[PDB]
Write a protein that binds this ligand. Structure first.
Ligand code: HEM
Ligand code: HEM
Ligand SMILES: Cc1cc(N)nc(CCCCCO[C@H]2CNC[C@H]2Cc2cc(C)cc(N)n2)c1
Ligand SMILES: Cc1cc(N)nc(CCCCCO[C@H]2CNC[C@H]2Cc2cc(C)cc(N)n2)c1
Ligand SMILES: C[C@H](O)[C@H](O)[C@H]1CNc2nc(N)[nH]c(=O)c2N1
Ligand SMILES: C[C@H](O)[C@H](O)[C@H]1CNc2nc(N)[nH]c(=O)c2N1
Ligand SMILES: [Zn+2]
Lengths: 404, 402
């Protein structure tokens, strides 16, 4: 074959060549000498070239590449950058850019859905209070009484010598994590720092395991302001198991809406520092990671004890048995509650379909194997057996430093 | 810059400095990561040779000695006259252990210093190869108390064909392709099965027929050798509580022994150098029995358990897999054959990472291979960042001989 990465599926014996990776402008963490794939954490004329590239992507997406409108838009952008140092996206350009950022996200297994994204344009927002209103609207629309809908809300872009719009919280919904006197944590240990930041900024803390955090919202060059979500806007699912009656007695729950709020959306050189987006959960994110990680709720031993498993020897597979029942409880409870959720089998089958769609549409799909393969039952899903090429395309969602 | 390597469960950071010692490239470039891929003159030989001799004398703390200097002259003298050289037995022993230590895909490396090395470099015929292989199997098997071992046959030489073992492992079950494309037995072994028959083997018709070995002395047709049934220890599979499981008629062999890899030491290449340890239960329970392109028994077990097969959200697949793994562990424990579960194995690997950090300043590891195929995030290795790179001595893939 050709001189592009050859990609193999070991289950089916089929081969593809990734030619899309040629479009990658930005380097990842690896070199010839060493693979750094498993690592969680990897303008002037510079703006113009990123902007030109994005405008070319837009016009090609609407099959008007080389058109008069295409060439006029290019001239517009360079003139605007020439005089002001920056430029602004048309509305349809933002919608295209946000969908493309999602389509481009190598860590997202949900990308079959990429073309179905509600884009709320909030580039008119001028205060923290209005951010909150926009966010509540997002949450209401996206939650939709359990019939979840993917959405993103985009706040004003970064601007030269003016402060950023930032949502301080890592997600729109987060449970408090309260550091105890003994040094243990009540609630979610992932959220200890954001919890202590909320208190420093005047929040009156609770002391439950599932206290919903307020939002800390920052408008340009202002201290962040604190906003409590009205509890009726935050849909949650109490967890029960279909046959283990005691599981409901554990008082476990999770919220419906996974909504990432700390990522930067980059489109044609422009940087949207506040641009929260939401989808629906894959069940392993809740049942395996959030509930069973040792550094999260860590409930495995408790569930195993209730199941009367032999927790004293690794070889009884007590961890695997408990984890499976916890995942089942998550699925069953969301289903009973009528809240959209997808299991890791159905999600990974749909990601394989996505890989085939993108092979034909673009000649490849950037994908992070370690993130795509679910954290339980890996080789039981078709993605385990699929080789993947990881690279950065733009538009992109990127990590950005915390605002404090 | 040297890689920062973080453990996300403990918050601890190390820096890998061992990777600087890498000379051969992996598949990745700055543009794109290819880490998930399964398949990625005299002065050149001389520099690899010297570097390996330096590794050796350093390992015995005699670096810079008379012995060291003289050995470097011997190697130099032999390469300059003949284009090649030969290893002393003790250097071979050191290189074999180092190749294993360096194997990025191996979760069992806490064991690396405990390897029995059989020198089979005085082998001159397929007949002799078979004798050496039977001794390896008998030693390694040890009536169920498994012992890691490697047997090293003669190195590649410029003027001739290679010594090769055609089979990918020393023990493999036949796969018989049916007229309608389906397979009886192990679908992974269809090609070696046909090669065996074609070289004269009378085939069986079972799901677990142990294959003969095809052994090749240089520039000769391979020869067929049936392993004596008493040499191949096997474990019938049953479940501690599910009575019908035994009725599935399942079984696996005790001894995992890879026989198709090339061992490279100091620039010299050992095209036949089979090595063996003991199994991690997920290799059998998860991959060999449940891969859809392997024995693919998930659905049969699910039905036997009376699971709801009609929907993925019942997690029938996850439930059947767990019980299959449990049966493997139980059965091996019952038969007194060494096995390690994925929790104990990954915990030991974490200890190995820490040992290697102190000893060498790093450890090459291939995350996708180290994390087990079920319950990944339930093991500590899932949460550990890892740097993959090629050090020498090394085990490598090589082309199939046919
Ligand atoms: C439609 C339902 C969706 C499902 C089932 C889904 C599934 C997932 C899963 C399972 C992860 C890994 C999360 C983890 O390990 O914590 C993920 C990560 C990601 N997803 Fe999707 N997703 C969906 C919608 C979306 C939407 C609407 C966007 C953006 C528009 C998106 C962009 C991302 C990004 C950027 C990451 C990486 C997060 C990070 O690095 O912190 N996802 N998603
Ligand atoms: C002591 C018992 C051992 C255990 C439990 C162990 C564990 C493993 C496991 C689980 C794999 C991945 C296998 C797969 O996914 O198919 C592996 C691969 C490997 N192991 Fe170890 N191992 C052990 C001994 C050894 C020994 C003695 C050597 C060499 C002297 C070795 C070298 C390798 C190599 C080269 C691979 C990669 C094989 C390939 O790429 O096909 N292992 N081992
Ligand atoms: C939109 C959406 C859908 C869906 N099903 N799931 C999600 C949740 C993704 C949340 C990912 C959280 O990532 C954190 C916690 N684990 C790894 C770490 C990676 C990371 C680091 C940083 C600095 C930021 C960030 N967003 N993500 C989001
Ligand atoms: C020593 C040892 C211990 C232990 N627990 N397990 C083993 C067996 C390792 C089996 C390796 C099988 O690898 C093949 C089949 N799946 C991935 C593929 C990788 C590969 C490709 C090629 C060309 C050769 C090769 N040896 N391995 C060996
Ligand atoms: C060290 C390792 O990269 C890390 O634990 C990764 C592995 N795979 C993952 N996969 C997903 N989806 N999410 C994660 O947070 C992680 N964590
Ligand atoms: C495509 C992907 O890399 C491939 O399926 C790998 C994943 N991880 C693995 N890990 C181990 N131990 N053995 C394997 O064969 C594989 N296969
Ligand atoms: Zn890489």
């Amino acid at each position: 074959g050709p001189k592009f990465p050859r990609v193999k599926n070991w289950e089916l014996g089929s081969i593809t060549y990734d030619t899309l990776c040629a479009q990658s402008q930005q380097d990842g963490p690896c070199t010839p000498r060493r693979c750094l794939g498993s690592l969680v954490l990897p303008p002037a004329e510079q703006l113009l070239s990123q902007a030109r590239d994005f405008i070319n992507q837009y016009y090609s997406s609407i099959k008007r590449s080389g058109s008069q409108a295409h060439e006029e838009r290019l001239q517009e952008v360079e003139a605007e950058v020439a005089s002001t140092g920056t430029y602004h996206l048309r509305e349809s350009e933002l919608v295209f850019g946000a969908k493309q950022a999602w389509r481009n996200a190598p860590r997202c297994v949900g990308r079959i859905q990429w073309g179905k994204l509600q884009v709320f344009d909030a580039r008119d927002c001028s205060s923290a209070q209005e951010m909150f209103t926009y966010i509540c609207n997002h949450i209401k629309y996206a939650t939709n009484r359990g019939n979840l809908r993917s959405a993103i809300t985009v706040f004003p872009q970064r601007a030269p010598g003016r402060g950023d719009f930032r949502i301080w919280n890592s997600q729109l919904v987060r449970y408090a994590g309260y550091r105890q006197q003994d040094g243990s944590v009540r609630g979610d240990p992932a959220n200890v720092e954001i919890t202590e930041l909320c208190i420093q900024h005047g929040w009156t803390p609770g002391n439950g395991r599932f206290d919903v955090l307020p939002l800390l919202l920052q408008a340009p060059d202002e201290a962040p302001e604190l906003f409590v979500l009205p509890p009726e806007l935050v849909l949650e699912v109490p967890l029960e198991h279909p046959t283990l009656e005691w599981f409901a007695a554990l008082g476990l729950r999770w919220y419906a809406l996974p909504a990432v709020s700390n990522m930067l959306l980059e489109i044609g050189g422009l940087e949207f520092s506040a641009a929260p987006f939401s989808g629906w959960y894959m069940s392993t994110e809740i049942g395996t990671r959030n509930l069973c990680d040792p550094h999260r709720y860590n409930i495995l031993e408790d569930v195993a004890v209730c199941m009367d498993l032999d927790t004293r020897t690794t070889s009884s597979l007590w961890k695997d048995k408990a984890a499976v029942e916890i995942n089942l409880a998550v699925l069953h409870s969301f289903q009973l509650a009528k809240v959209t959720i997808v299991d890791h089998h159905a999600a990974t089958v749909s990601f394989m379909k996505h890989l085939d769609n993108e092979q034909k549409a673009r000649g490849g799909c950037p994908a992070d194997w370690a993130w795509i393969v679910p954290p339980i039952s890996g080789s039981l899903t078709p993605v385990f057996h699929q080789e993947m090429v990881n690279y950065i395309l733009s538009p992109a969602f990127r990590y950005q430093p915390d605002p404090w």
